Amino acid sequence: PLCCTLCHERLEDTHFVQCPSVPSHKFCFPCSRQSIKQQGVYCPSGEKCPLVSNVPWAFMQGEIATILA
Amino acid sequence: RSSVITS
Ligand SMILES: [Zn+2]
Ligand SMILES: [Zn+2]
Ligand SMILES: [Zn+2]
């Protein structure tokens, strides 16, 4: 489903964050920005989802910077 | 790993 699983804004014409494990974990950039600023940063769903293994995935610093802009 | 930022 192509909309944010937090704010439920459609993501059909823009960019978003896609959890590598859970397909239904889509997040708009504002929602991703709120999770980054609050976390410090794992999956904005809070389920600390893992990589494509079991170690939980986290935003790279360059991804964090892109979202904040 | 691929970016979580998608379009
Ligand atoms: Zn959202
Ligand atoms: Zn939705
Ligand atoms: Zn997730």
- Tokens standing for residue A15: 């960019």
Name the experimental technique.
Answer: X-ray
Amino acid at A2: L
Experimental structure resolution, Å: 2.4
> Beta-carbon neighbour count of residue A16 at 10 Å?
21
Name the superfamily (CATH) of residues A17-68: Interferon regulatory factor 2-binding protein (1.10.10.1580)
Collapsed DSSP state (helix, strand, coil) of residue A26: strand
Q: Do A66 and B4 touch (CB under 8 A)?
A: no
Which chain B residues touch A52 with a CB distance below 8 Å?
Answer: 1
What is the C-alpha separation between B7 and A51, in angstroms, rounded?
20
Which chain B residues touch A17 with a CB distance below 8 Å?
Answer: 4-6
Vertex A17, ends A20 and B4: CA angle to 5°? 45
